[PDB]
Amino acid sequence: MRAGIRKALIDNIKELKGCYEPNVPNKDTKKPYMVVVQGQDNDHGETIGFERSIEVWIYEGRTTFKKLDKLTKQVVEVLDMNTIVDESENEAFTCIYKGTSENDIVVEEWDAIARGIRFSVIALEDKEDTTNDRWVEALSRHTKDLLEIESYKDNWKKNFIAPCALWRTTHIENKRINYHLIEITKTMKCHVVSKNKDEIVKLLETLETSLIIDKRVRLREDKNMYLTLVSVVEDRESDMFTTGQLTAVFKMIGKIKREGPTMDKIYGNGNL
Amino acid sequence: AFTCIYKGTSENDIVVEEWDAIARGIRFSVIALEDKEDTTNDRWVEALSRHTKDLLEIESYKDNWKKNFIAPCALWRTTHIENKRINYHLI
Amino acid sequence: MRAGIRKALIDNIKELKGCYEPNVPNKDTKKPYMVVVQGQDNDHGETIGFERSIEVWIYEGRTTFKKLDKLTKQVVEVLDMNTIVDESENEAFTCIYKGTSENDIVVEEWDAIARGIRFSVIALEDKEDTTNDRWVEALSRHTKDLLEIESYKDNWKKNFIAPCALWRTTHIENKRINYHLI
Amino acid sequence: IEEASFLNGSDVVILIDGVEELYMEEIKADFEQDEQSIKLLGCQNEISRVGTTKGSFSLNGYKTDSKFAKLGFRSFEIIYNLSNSETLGYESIRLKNCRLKKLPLINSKAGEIVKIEVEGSFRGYDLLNE
Amino acid sequence: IEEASFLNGSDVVILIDGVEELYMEEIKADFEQDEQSIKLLGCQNEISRVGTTKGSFSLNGYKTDSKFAKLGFRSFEIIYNLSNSETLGYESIRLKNCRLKKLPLINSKAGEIVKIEVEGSFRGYDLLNE
Amino acid sequence: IEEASFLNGSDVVILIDGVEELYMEEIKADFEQDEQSIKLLGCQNEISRVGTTKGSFSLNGYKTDSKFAKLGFRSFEIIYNLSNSETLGYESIRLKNCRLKKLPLINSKAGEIVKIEVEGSFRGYDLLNE
Amino acid sequence: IEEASFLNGSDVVILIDGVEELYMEEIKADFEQDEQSIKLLGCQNEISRVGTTKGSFSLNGYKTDSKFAKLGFRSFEIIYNLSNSETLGYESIRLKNCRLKKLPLINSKAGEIVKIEVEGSFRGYDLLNE
């Protein structure tokens, strides 16, 4: 994954002289050069899975910090949410801009000025993008058809292509409302990730309107089943990745499939 | 452009003897670095920001703060949205 | 548990030259090698019991960090929720992948690059897998019969075989609804 | 666990006097009967009879116009299409000679939406579809 | 999704006897009929007719003066302008010969605002606008 | 935004039989009249008339003495001063010949304050002020 | 603490007119009797007798079809099987000659599931099994 970030930075930034591993460069390396330090991997719940931290430490020749500001903006533009393909490992990923190092440090012995940009990567372990939750599959298919963006089903995948949507299930309730009938209620929350926030607003608006108007969703292309909406709510303040904006509650009624024997043959006899 | 916001002051008033000087650190901040648009697809936010601007003769910044906000101003974000189909024809 | 983890890592990973205890290897050791540091045991409630922390520090010859990334993926695959049998103690366990050390460190004096993978083990003190809660026993039996996976009743056991399912009881209420009925 | 379905109440389409009504929120209609309980002279079990039928109906909704106030007590038809979406077997009912019991001229609280309530009686019905 | 509009109930403007009323917060008015159910031999369903009409109304609001207690049981008109804002089609109704059923002389609780409640009967109505 | 005012019900001063009553919590009083609805022989809307009036009242408050139980069913007057303080126009009403409908000897729950409730009827009223 | 078993109400199987009914939520049925209180001429305590009986029943459930509207006021049987899973001793009751008191043609609120309510009367019952 180091190779992907290094290759992207070298290809897209031309002021850059080289991008190295942590303790590679010597004192005669030509500045500006960048260093790709890989941080922790922490478990961040079911929706994100394991989140990795990265730092892209920029180094510059101590002329002035304005060049470092320009180069920082260039790096952030290059890596922030743009999918990167790692040829060495033949697996892609998508860095998320998180912030910047504590201060802008000056290192006198090296005669340089440094700043550390702070990225992260989502869902390191997840490598399938599939779900046994039929409801999630149905709603992700519906969102993809309505919206013409990628729709990931159970949890984030590391190479998500923004703009995209996610349709995880957060809560399930089952009830036997009758002898023959059962009722399955799911509170399914949805994310809409995109670089442009107004695009997030537009996508959420049209998704809400589509869910409200067509109040139910075909569970399968075979039909024979449907998902009736109950309430769709958006909390725009909520986090784009961890929580998700749109919350929708769906329910579906099923009947027990009793297929017992049959009274094919009937006979009776008489007395007095 | 941008607009610095006063936030406080460094931990103590320090005296650096070797430099023969007294130093203090004032602490500012800048808001919404990445925002560059001042626009919103939320028609409601646009409507209320326009209404506030017309009523009040101050700026209005719609969905989120912008780094070069000119005080005094008034932002009009939307925090929570609920949709209901109250009828066969109405929402 | 050091012997079990070391044996598993040596058997399953072939690029490994050796797996040592913390301050064993000298500067003549052939890299890459691994080090099994054993952390705290902390009480984490009734369901987990005592949880032990383990770190498997990988070391590599400072060629490039991509080798260390590959080796870390190999270790995580080998140890993550795969039941391990410690022949020395004759007691099994199941390491749970938990994360990775703070940064990828370079150690110049040793001329190596190191990374610390972080595991843990659950319910160290639990050694029975039995329950006097008849309800839990009944539901664990029902789950096992329906589902064809293990069921562990009152609390986790250290050598749990994934996939599985616990059936602990979290809350009990008793009422005398009548003179004769409870 | 084969499929079933509930007829969600937001599928109704109420046509009052041949023009579709958009703002109705609730509709009720029943076909009463006087039982005419008969106690025979020898049998201990009471016996019922059909007697005479008597329709009654009610409506609630939001006030959009003075349709009902201007309608007066004139006879008018109500058609009610309860569509099912899982399967397309809409249930359609027609009410004949409906007559408002009272004109809801004014009903309006200060801080709330102005809802209209209607109730009356209908002479008969036609189960158009099912 | 073309526009729609609900008539908010705070657009009411009640004119009691030619002077505008500011403190009313709820107004009701209906035009009851007598059903006059009739059985016919050889016709199982009952039949209804208009009968004689009978108005009734009610009002609630905050007490600002003794207008109603001074009014007594005199006949007085009520006008009800329910304006609409999305489109300017106010619905105006006039009630003819309203007469209080009871004078609310005193209705007061220690901790609350002193509210006035009124109800009576009106001989007829004129639907001025819609 | 020009001033308005609500008459808070804690401004009430009730004088029962010439001696001020200071433990009351609420007071109600209405002047009912029998409607005497008449259905004319040719006209299709009912007509009402004033009929005969009949006062009724009611009070609740905290028990502080045996004033009411000792009062019996004697006739007694009630004054009611609802002072307004934003503007000093107090509304004063007198009730003539009030008579308790039922003498509330005992009404007391174990864990609560002993409140007294009264209801009755008054022949007429005098609107002393407004 | 030997075992005991309530009867869960989701074990009910209702056969309306020989075809099983799946969507019923609750069923009620009682067998009234006119008390016929007799005050003897010398004895102080009242005496009551069996009098004449009369069945009544009620149903609620989700609307899945127009079975009841089709059924009209016809006579029809209801059989009700309440199984006890913990002992297998199902209590079965049959109602004879049930007759709807009113056809629930329409009963539907906008935002909710369309439920059907039925009530009527039955001449007699047979306790098929217990």
Author numbering:
A (entry chain H): 1 to 272
B (entry chain N): 92 to 182
C (entry chain L): 1 to 182
D (entry chain E), E (entry chain F), F (entry chain A), G (entry chain D): 7 to 136
Sentences from the paper on this structure:
The overall RMSD between all proteins of the neck in the extended state compared with the contracted state is 0.34 Å, indicating that no large conformational change occurs in this region during phage contraction. The neck-proximal sheath protein rotates to accommodate the contraction-induced movements of the other sheath proteins in the tail below, pivoting around Gly260 in the gp53 C-terminal linker. The terminal sheath ring proximal to the neck proteins still maintains some contact with the tail tube.
Here, we reveal the extended and contracted atomic structures of an intact contractile-tailed phage (φCD508) that binds to and penetrates the protective S-layer of the Gram-positive human pathogen Clostridioides difficile. The virion can be divided into five distinct regions: the head, neck, tail, baseplate, and needle. Structures of purified φCD508 virions in both extended and contracted conformations were determined by single-particle EM of frozen-hydrated samples; the resolution ranged from 2.6 to 4.0 Å for the extended phage, and 2.9 to 4.2 Å for the contracted form.
